[PDB]
Amino acid sequence: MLQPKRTKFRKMHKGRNRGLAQGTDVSFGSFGLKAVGRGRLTARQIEAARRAMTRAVKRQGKIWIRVFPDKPITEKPLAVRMGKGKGNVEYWVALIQPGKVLYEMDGVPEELAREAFKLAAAKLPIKTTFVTKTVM
């Protein structure tokens, strides 16, 4: 499960996931899964979607993960009142704006890429789409 190997601070502010994405161009691989919808992906969802792709495309091909969590989400325990401290860190999320390339794929047919990316797309909460590396 993906997680930052040591951080500056343990507990981060909530913030607001706003604006458009930056990692929009398909940089490394041939194909890729772009996020249409806005949201935030947990460390478990990314790993769950990666396994769905990696198992669909077999040993062959090459996969990237453009997203990484680096935002610790706090969760307050059950049967606990308000206040008396910020809650403990449970899981890590990557905030996803619209137009964010999540995964990229290379060394496979354009058919099998889409069929593999659907299985991953089904794991994720965000609404996604297939994209190809357009040259400039």
């Binding site: 458009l20 929009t24 137009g99 040259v135």
Partner: protein, 92 residues
């Protein structure tokens, strides 16, 4: 590879949106010792034109006010998630 395009008169955020929501999109031509030229053109042509790999390499002749200006597509702005162009920079 013969794009046809009108000259822009209103330019900014407000005009560009009204334009972009009318099956067109703004672009610009520039290069050499001459001044730059702001250029309004149709979306559905240039969307179909970019599918070919020659578009981002070969020379294009843009028709403006009768005059055909020879240019190459230097830079381009994709719409974040929807498959559509926002803007193109034509180097001379």
């Amino acid at each position: 590879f013969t794009i046809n395009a009108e000259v822009r008169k209103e330019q900014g955020k407000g005009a560009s949106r009204r334009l972009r929501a009318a099956n067109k999109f703004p672009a610009i031509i520039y290069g050499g010792k001459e001044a730059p030229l702001a250029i309004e053109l149709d979306h559905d042509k240039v969307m179909n034109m970019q599918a070919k790999a020659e578009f981002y390499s070969e020379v294009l002749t843009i028709v403006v006010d009768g005059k055909e200006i020879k240019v190459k597509a230097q830079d381009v702005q994709r719409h974040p998630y929807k498959p559509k162009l926002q803007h193109i920079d034509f180097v001379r």
